[PDB]
């Protein structure tokens, strides 16, 4: 038989890709009964969207998992609809139909009521809490008290029928402020129907009754249009809870009867030929055989089946069937390819759901610091699993109880929500439970007890975890979607997907024709190694990413086997394989080819896309890490002993393809680490996504194909996908993880400048600067680099050319400004000013200016003053010196900065300091008095005129402000004296005040004397 495989979706990663979660209204016991999903139901329609509903004890829930291409089929939120009572203890209660751009849902609570809810698609897309309508109307159409329902079946937005245990079928019509109703009205009732089904040509239903009659119904008449008699006596003896007895493709429909213990089942795909007089019925096919793995009294149970045919042409039909026994499940699909044959041509696919405990052994050794400590490793195990969710939460706040109850602690469970902190809470709870007993030697402690304590602690925890998913992981239904044409699947609280085996999987199962045995036997050889072994190997290869290209490439070959002798590796095993190797016909020419044989425009992509693809490709990448590591381990376990005979060149040799393979490993494991509008897709939280969005038959398969293919491709892309990745992604977020990620990524110009910008974003200037230094740019004006070349390119174009170097350094100067760190800018701006080999006017000018800024941001050493002077002497870019020197006196040292205004040329200083003067009277400051005295000094350098004028202006201002008299008067005294002295210093020449001289000064002397008299009066009053 053919195999199938599953793709599990963690509800927490859903909650990741779903920002908000709104709820609308209308110990171990409580933990077990905490979650389940009494039933499961997923609908979708012809037009556009998709969502799943999840059931719960006293609760109802629903969220958006659609793979579409719209304006916003991506921004999503999870909806919790709380109910007075549970969604019935049975399979019933569920209907979903739309109308026009809205979702209409019908339900039934536990005892006796119906529910009608209408939710807007927009409401799903929006982050918004609010709704400004009557989203629902509860109603009671028929008396359910009298007749309890057993089957609900939708027909239209307005209307929906119901089936009762008694066997009658009512119909219901609701309308705003309105409801009108119709009928054809262990405990049993020989006209009850087991399971109703609906398909429309316009309005026709199909039924199977307790009488075991096939009743076909016309909605207009509300009477049974047709009846067929199916005669089996041992058939109704078998009664199933829930289960769908019938389903459907398009116009045609199928159903089947197990025939009890035989587990035969069937396919009776009826073709309904609707004639004008009356709709006609023609069933055309007998029975379909089963598979036989379910046995040992293990109860196979038909959970749900869905029939879908190829609308392309009647060549094949496919039926998807889901079985379950207990928590365990089996899934299979039967494909029938017929045209004329009354024969039965059916391919079958098989599936296995099982539990492999990776727990018990990995626990023992945490000795190496490749992945050190203890706890962190286990947490990383729980994250490596990545498929079980609230079970964890339960276990955590069950252990933190210390024999505490639930009813209050339960709310404390609901409360946490936020994931990042969860992990911290995990560890905090763990350390507070395990007492560390001292060694009693001398104030020392016994870590060897902390050893067992911790190991078996997290072991017991994760065992209760597996028990909350040996109680939770459960399947119930399957629902196909036309718009997507995909094999959907419903597990309890864990959505999933069905997929065909990939080559790596088929060859990881360990199940012109040669070479394959080497691969399988080899897989066994890899599986032979220990855990600490693979720890050493991963750390070593992690060391083989950047540093490795530095050594001589092909001598390290034997060295890796010299690293392989440390594990068990019995010489018996060795030689046993060696014997195989020598018997090989011609290994390389076959291997390289057959493995070489193993080897993208997007609309706005949703989120289930990215996360489901994340989990599945994580699976594919881990199994890949397996297969390649295998390949290598072998490659040097062979070419170890008999070195001269290896170099005889009788073998083709393999070093080159070896290198290629290591590139491959670097990428893949880079990804293995990485899992730990489209722009809004990037706007979602989970990691590794950005990649899938970067690389967008079912859509999923092809768009993952695009990714994995883009990984395989080596030299053709001429670029490392890692560098590409971090290049764009750095741009958005995750600035901190791309630290270890850039420390990991292979050294390249691209990689270099990124190392720079990132070590910059971390504000670890130094090393970023060393990165900046040890490289340059010839990559500029390529544009292939995204949204980062463009700056440097704009800058290069700003010089009308492409100057070799100085420009880069310039760009680096501005970038150094963006860091607010000004000193490194002093450095680079220098380098820019100097290395210019172009001799452009414009360029040299721009460079000298940025240098001016960087220097003025530093101030410091005196030269940055004659930089100013260069700029002042060159053209009329004096304004630079203005603001700049302003910033320098904003560092603020006049005794030095004025002496620096000394070597500056007195013309330029006259300009500059007059301007500064004007700015200082303008500023009205309190240390402006100082400013004024300093300008005065400067004037003493010059003609010594203006100073006095400015003194008068100042005086005017002090006065204008306020009048307290008192001290103010004496200040003014002092000012009079000042002016008097400046005048005595300037006897002959004459000065002029806009906005006179000696006379107005006799006047101010008069003011003086006045104030004197005033004072004396004050002293004779006292």
């Amino acid at each position: 038989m053919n195999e199938l495989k599953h793709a599990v979706v963690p509800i927490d990663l859903q909650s990741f890709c779903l920002e908000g979660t709104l709820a609308l209204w209308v110990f171990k016991k409580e933990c077990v009964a905490y979650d389940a999903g009494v039933y499961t139901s997923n609908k979708s329609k012809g037009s556009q969207t998709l969502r799943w509903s999840i059931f719960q004890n006293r609760t109802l829930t629903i969220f958006d998992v659609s793979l579409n291409s719209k304006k916003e089929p991506l921004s999503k939120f999870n909806v919790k609809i709380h109910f007075p009572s549970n969604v019935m203890k049975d399979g019933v209660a569920f209907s979903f139909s739309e109308h026009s751009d809205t979702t209409i849902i019908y339900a039934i609570t536990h005892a006796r009521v119906l529910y009608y809810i209408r939710l807007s698609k927009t409401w799903f897309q929006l982050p918004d809490a609010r709704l400004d309508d009557d989203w629902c109307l509860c109603y009671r159409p028929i008396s359910f008290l009298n007749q309890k329902p057993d089957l609900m079946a939708a027909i239209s937005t307005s209307e929906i029928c119901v089936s009762f245990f008694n066997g009658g079928l009512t119909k219901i019509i609701l309308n705003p402020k309105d409801a009108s109703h119709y009928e054809q009205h262990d405990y049993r009732s020989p006209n009850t129907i087991i399971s109703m089904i609906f398909l429309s040509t316009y309005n026709v239903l199909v039924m199977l009754s307790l009488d075991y009659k096939l009743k076909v119904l016309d909605l207009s008449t509300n009477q049974c249009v047709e009846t067929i008699e199916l005669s089996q006596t041992i058939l109704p003896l078998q009664s199933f809870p829930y289960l769908t007895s019938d389903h459907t493709t398009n116009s045609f429909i199928a159903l089947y009867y197990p025939d009890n213990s035989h587990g035969s089942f069937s396919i009776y795909k009826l073709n309904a030929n609707a004639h004008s007089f009356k709709l006609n019925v023609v069933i055309e096919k007998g029975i379909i055989p089963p598979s036989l793995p379910d046995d040992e009294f293990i109860p196979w149970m038909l959970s749900d089946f869905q029939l879908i045919s190829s609308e392309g042409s009647q060549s094949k039909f496919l039926l998807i069937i889901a079985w379950k026994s207990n928590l365990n499940t089996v899934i299979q699909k039967c494909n029938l390819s017929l045209d004329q044959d009354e024969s039965f041509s059916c391919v079958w696919s098989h599936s296995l759901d099982s539990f492999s405990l990776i727990e018990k052994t990995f626990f023992d050794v945490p000795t190496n610091m490749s992945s050190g400590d203890i706890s962190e490793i286990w947490l990383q195990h729980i994250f490596a699993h990545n498929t079980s969710i609230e079970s964890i939460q339960v276990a955590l706040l069950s252990f933190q109880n210390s024999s505490s109850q639930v009813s209050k602690n339960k709310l404390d469970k609901f409360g946490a929500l936020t994931i990042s902190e969860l992990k911290n809470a995990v560890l905090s709870s763990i350390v507070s439970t395990i007492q560390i007993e001292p060694n009693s030697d001398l104030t020392g402690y016994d870590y060897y007890e902390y050893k067992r304590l911790l190991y078996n602690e997290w072991e017991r925890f994760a065992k209760l975890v597996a028990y909350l998913d040996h109680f939770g992981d459960e399947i119930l239904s399957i629902n196909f979607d036309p718009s997507n044409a995909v094999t959907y699947i419903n597990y309890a609280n864990k959505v999933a997907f069905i997929r065909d085996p990939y080559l790596i999987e088929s060859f990881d199962e360990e199940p012109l024709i040669e070479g394959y045995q080497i691969l399988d036997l080899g897989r066994s050889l890899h599986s032979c190694m220990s855990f600490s072994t693979l720890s050493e190997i991963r750390y070593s290869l992690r060391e083989l990413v950047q540093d490795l290209p530095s050594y001589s490439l092909f001598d390290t070959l034997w060295v890796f086997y010299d690293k392989h002798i440390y594990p068990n590796v019995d010489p018996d095993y060795i030689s046993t394989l060696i014997d195989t190797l020598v018997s090989l016909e011609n290994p390389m020419r076959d291997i390289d080819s057959l493995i070489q044989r193993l080897r993208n425009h997007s609309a706005q992509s949703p989120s289930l896309f990215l996360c489901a693809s994340v989990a599945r490709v994580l699976d594919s990448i881990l199994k890949k890490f397996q297969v390649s590591i295998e390949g290598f381990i072998f490659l040097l376990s062979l070419i170890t002993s008999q070195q001269d005979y290896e170099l005889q060149s009788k073998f083709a040799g393999c070093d080159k393809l070896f290198l290629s393979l290591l590139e491959d490993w670097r990428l893949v494991s880079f990804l293995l680490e990485n899992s730990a509008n489209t722009m809004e897709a990037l706007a979602s939280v989970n990691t590794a996504l950005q990649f899938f969005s970067a690389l967008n038959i079912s859509p999923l398969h092809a768009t993952v194909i695009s990714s994995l293919s883009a990984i395989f491709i080596r030299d053709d892309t001429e670029n490392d996908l890692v560098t590409e990745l971090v290049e764009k992604l750095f741009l958005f977020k995750q600035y901190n993880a791309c630290m270890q990620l850039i420390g990991w990524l292979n050294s390249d110009p691209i990689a270099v400048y990124l190392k720079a910008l990132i070590y910059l974003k971390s504000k670890e200037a130094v090393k970023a600067v060393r990165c900046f230094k040890t490289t340059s740019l010839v990559l500029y004006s390529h544009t292939s680099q995204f949204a980062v070349l463009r700056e440097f390119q704009e800058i290069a174009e700003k010089y009308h050319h492409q100057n070799l170097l100085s420009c880069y350094y310039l760009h680096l100067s501005k970038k150094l400004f963006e860091e607010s760190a000004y000193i490194d800018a002093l450095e680079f701006s220098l380098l820019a000013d100097a290395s210019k080999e172009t001799d452009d006017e414009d360029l040299s000018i721009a460079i000298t200016h940025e240098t001016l800024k960087t220097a003025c941001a530093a101030g410091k050493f005196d030269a940055a003053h004659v930089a100013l002077m260069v700029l002042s002497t060159t053209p009329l870019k004096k304004s630079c010196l203005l603001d700049f020197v302003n910033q320098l006196t904003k560092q603020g040292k006049i005794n030095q900065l004025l002496n620096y205004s000394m070597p500056t040329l007195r013309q330029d200083v006259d300009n500059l300091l007059e301007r500064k003067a004007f700015q200082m009277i303008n500023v009205e400051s309190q240390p402006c008095w100082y400013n004024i005295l300093f300008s005065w000094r400067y004037k003493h350098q010059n003609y010594r005129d203006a100073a006095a004028i400015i003194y008068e202006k100042l005086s005017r201002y002090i006065s204008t402000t306020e009048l307290i008299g008192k001290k103010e008067r004496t200040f003014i005294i002092e000012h009079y004296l000042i002016v008097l002295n400046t005048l005595e210093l300037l006897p002959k020449e004459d000065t002029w005040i806009l906005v006179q001289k000696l006379l107005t000064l006799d006047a101010i002397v008069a003011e003086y004397h006045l104030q004197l008299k005033d004072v004396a009066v004050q002293v004779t009053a006292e």
Binding site: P366, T367, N368, M369, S370, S371, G372, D373, I374, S375, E376, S420, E421, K423, N424, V426, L427, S428, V431, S432, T433, I434, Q435, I436, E437, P438, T443, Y447, Y539, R542, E543, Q546, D547, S550, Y551, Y735, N736, M739, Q740, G743, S762, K763, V766, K767, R770, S820, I823, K860, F861
Partner: protein, 343 residues
């Protein structure tokens, strides 16, 4: 405060007192772009405000930048002649031990290339180890880097012994345990904190990441800035995050289940904490970018004490052994400031 200028073309990277050796505790080294400069601190008459002034003694030229700097116990004085031993990190990504008589480098050992760190070196420290007979048996230098490696470099009587150890993440600080050179502490960028016996798995690993009190979320990226021992027997461990979050654990009695105390600095601490040499409960931390320094008391005696605010960025700082003075290197100078309360 008294301020002492560094030479005009000297850009400082690191500042450390020679507290490790009592014979030389008034020696201050500044690692810069062309070497390591030595200053002497003396009690002038001054005013007994700052009764301590700095005298620049000399400058050791190396020709390349010095980023980290540690004196060893081997330092000595003679009449006059200073016999120095310095561990430091250079621009070529090498780790070096330089042994001098004053400004003249009489001897130099260099650990680099592939035999050295394979990425940027983030920290270094040094301790002298003596035999049972009590001659100088070994000088031991520990260093950590971005190559996910911790390196123990032992210089012994029969010559050098080199050893490398793998880390789960880049090493950002390392320091031998006070009064017990057999033990040391290593810090990983990711929050892991290793206690290690190099004479020998390594004994113990704490972690600050999952412990953040979260009463106030310390943020998404709270990269570990610093971990240092406190006490003169190395009775304690203090860790500080870039975010300003700090935590203290003691090592004696009974069984232990959480860190003993925890808090948060008013500001981010790019350079990390510098614990007081005399008062365990106290440490200093800088807002290096705006040039403020907060003083923190572990048992909350502190109530936000910010004795130091400059109008300029702080490059580095360290306590003088006396516990009342602080030396601070800024981008163009070194200040000695005396807090009157600690006298």
């Amino acid at each position: 405060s008294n301020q002492y200028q560094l030479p005009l073309n000297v850009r400082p990277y690191t500042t450390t007192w020679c507290s490790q050796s009592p014979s030389c505790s008034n020696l201050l080294a500044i690692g810069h772009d062309t070497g390591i400069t030595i200053y002497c601190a003396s009690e002038e008459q001054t005013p007994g405000s700052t009764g301590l002034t700095l005298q620049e003694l000399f400058t050791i030229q190396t020709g390349l930048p010095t980023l980290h700097l540690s004196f060893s116990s081997s330092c000595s004085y003679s009449e006059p002649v200073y016999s120095l031993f310095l561990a430091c990190v250079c621009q070529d990504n090498t780790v070096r031990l330089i042994i001098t008589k004053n400004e003249t480098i009489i001897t130099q050992h260099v650990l680099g290339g592939k035999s050295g760190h394979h990425n940027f070196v983030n920290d270094i420290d040094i301790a002298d180890v003596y035999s049972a007979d009590n001659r100088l048996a070994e000088q031991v230098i520990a260093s950590v880097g971005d190559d996910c490696t911790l390196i123990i470099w032992r210089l012994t009587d029969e010559g050098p012994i080199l050893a490398g150890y793998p880390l789960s993440s880049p090493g950002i600080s390392v320091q031998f345990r006070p009064s017990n050179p057999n033990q040391l502490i290593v810090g990983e960028r990711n929050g892991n904190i290793r206690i290690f016996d190099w004479t020998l798995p390594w004994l113990l690993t704490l972690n600050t990441l999952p412990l953040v009190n979260t009463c106030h979320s310390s943020g998404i990226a709270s990269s570990l800035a610093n971990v240092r021992w406190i006490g003169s027997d190395g009775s304690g461990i203090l860790a500080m995050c870039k975010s300003g979050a700090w935590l203290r654990w003691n090592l004696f009695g009974p069984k232990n289940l959480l860190p003993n105390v925890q808090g948060i600095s008013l500001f981010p601490s790019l350079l990390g904490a510098c614990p007081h040499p005399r008062y365990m409960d106290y440490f200093a931390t800088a807002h290096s970018q705006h040039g403020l320094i907060q003083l923190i008391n572990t048992y909350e005696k502190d109530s936000n004490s910010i004795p130091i605010q400059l109008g300029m960025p702080i490059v580095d700082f360290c306590w003088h052994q006396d516990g009342s003075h602080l030396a601070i290197a800024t981008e163009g100078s070194v200040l000695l400031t005396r807090l009157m309360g600690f006298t």
